[PDB]
Amino acid sequence: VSITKCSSDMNGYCLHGQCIYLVDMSQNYCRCEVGYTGVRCEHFFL
């Protein structure tokens, strides 16, 4: 369990989800809303 939140000008990928940051894999980790139809929270299938 090692992750962090995001800052400003950093929300341009995940629209429906929380922004996070992987420390073991220094990269942008955005958790989408459980219920979307893509691994990028953008189009709601339901």
UniProtKB/Swiss-Prot annotation:
Subcellular localization(s) per the UniProt record: Secreted, Extracellular space
Highest rank taxon of the organism: Eukaryota
Record-annotated EGF-like domain positions: 2-42
Record topological domains on the Extracellular side: 1-46
Disulfide-linked positions: 6-19, 14-30, 32-41
Name of the protein in question: Epiregulin
Naturally occurring in which organism (per UniProt): Homo sapiens (Human)
Name of the gene: EREG
